[PDB]
């Protein structure tokens, strides 16, 4: 194998990305080319580049190696998951319902199926119903509130800000080192803004700003956090002037930023 490319794709896949159209194109090409030089890995390996067609849809070879697996897969729910994926590709919405809901009647594990289920219920933009669904389902779900993250994303897209920043917090907790996610929940309360907002928000915001000494987003972030959230013109010039000296401190690092920008 071009084991260089082998590990490269192991990573790319493992990187858990979705910029797979042309990249994964080259990939699946090389897969079809040197699966011989590959061996056991292909057992799911090409799948990665393959699942690009899942999006992309060079469905001929896709379904072909797919059935190759569906046989090699000696008939398990995972091939059925690929099957729900294809029914999606086939736009077989209610037929995908048939298939997926059936697997449910058989296997309850991969809510990724149900993920697509709600995602289809609202795929065209029916967000509200499938959203209440996703609510009861996260209630059924237990784990990667990353899921619940995107859920709340839709929610605060509908301005469900309260529970939104709530979950933002909860997540960052589950992500004890949620540096960029600190930035996120920071920006969440920013979108909120406000006094107690200012407190918790700028707290996490600068906490990471420090923690991410490269997060210039967070720079202006905790900055405006203090500078505006509670700081509405009624701001108390004791604490306002204190945070304003700190804002000058920001601005000093910012003149330095303009300098390193000259650099």
């Amino acid at each position: 194998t071009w084991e260089e490319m082998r590990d490269k794709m192991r990573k790319w896949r493992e990187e858990n990305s979705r910029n797979s159209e042309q990249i994964v194109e080259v990939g699946e090409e090389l897969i079809n080319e040197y699966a011989s030089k590959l061996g056991d890995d292909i057992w799911i390996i090409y799948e990665q580049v393959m699942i690009a067609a899942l999006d992309y849809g060079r469905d001929d070879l896709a379904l072909f190696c797919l059935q190759e697996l569906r046989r090699q897969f000696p008939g398990s729910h995972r091939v059925k998951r690929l099957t729900g994926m294809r029914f999606e590709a086939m736009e077989r919405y209610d037929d995908a319902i048939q298939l997926y809901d059936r697997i449910l009647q058989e296997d309850p594990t991969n809510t990724a199926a149900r993920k697509r289920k709600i995602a289809i219920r609202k795929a065209q933009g029916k967000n509200v119903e499938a959203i209440r669904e996703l609510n009861e389902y996260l209630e059924q779900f237990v784990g990667d509130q990353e899921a619940w993250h995107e859920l709340a994303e839709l929610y605060i897209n509908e301005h469900d800000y309260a529970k939104a920043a709530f979950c933002l917090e909860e997540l960052m907790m589950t992500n004890p080192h949620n540096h960029l996610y600190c930035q996120q929940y920071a920006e969440v309360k920013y979108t909120q803004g406000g006094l107690e907002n200012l407190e918790l928000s700028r707290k996490y915001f600068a906490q990471a700003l420090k923690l991410n000494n490269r997060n210039m987003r967070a720079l202006f972030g905790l900055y405006m956090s203090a500078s505006h959230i509670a700081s509405n013109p009624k701001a108390s010039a004791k604490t306002k002037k204190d945070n304003m000296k700190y804002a000058s401190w920001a601005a000093s690092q910012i003149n330095r930023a303009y300098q390193f920008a000259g650099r």
């Binding site: 784990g143 589950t174 407190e199 420090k210 330095r256």
Partner: protein, 177 residues
Amino acid sequence: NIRLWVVLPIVIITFFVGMIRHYVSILLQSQEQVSDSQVLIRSRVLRENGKYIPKQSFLTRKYYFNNPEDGFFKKTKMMKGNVTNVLPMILIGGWINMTFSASWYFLNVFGLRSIYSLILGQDNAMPADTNKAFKTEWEALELTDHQWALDDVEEELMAKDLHFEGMFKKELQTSIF
């Protein structure tokens, strides 16, 4: 003389125990409760994190806890394989006995740790939770409303370091440029 012809049995037993490990591994290889358990883990983790959680967030979680814990407690209101793994010792014992210094049993007791390590290149080998939840949660929520004050305090302590340290942050960014 006959040295090796009996010696090699050592390596025999070695790879044999190797087979025991790997094979027997394959052999041992040969939902509502789960979701609830996941929730219980999350709750314990929540207590564990507490300190990281900010006081406003802690308070909101504390309100959720007070409503539950009581609510949570309300909601959650043979030797076959051992003998199997053991008997092989006796089988090999009788085997080597027929295959009779004591270095046999010696190296037998000996090799295990090192070998198995290098062998794999690795080791090669409901109501009570509810009550605990109510009790612990209510104590934990008091402990972490104090942790919560500490979480918020972090902001204030951080503030001065961050304020002065902003020029140093610019330096750090430029260094990581």
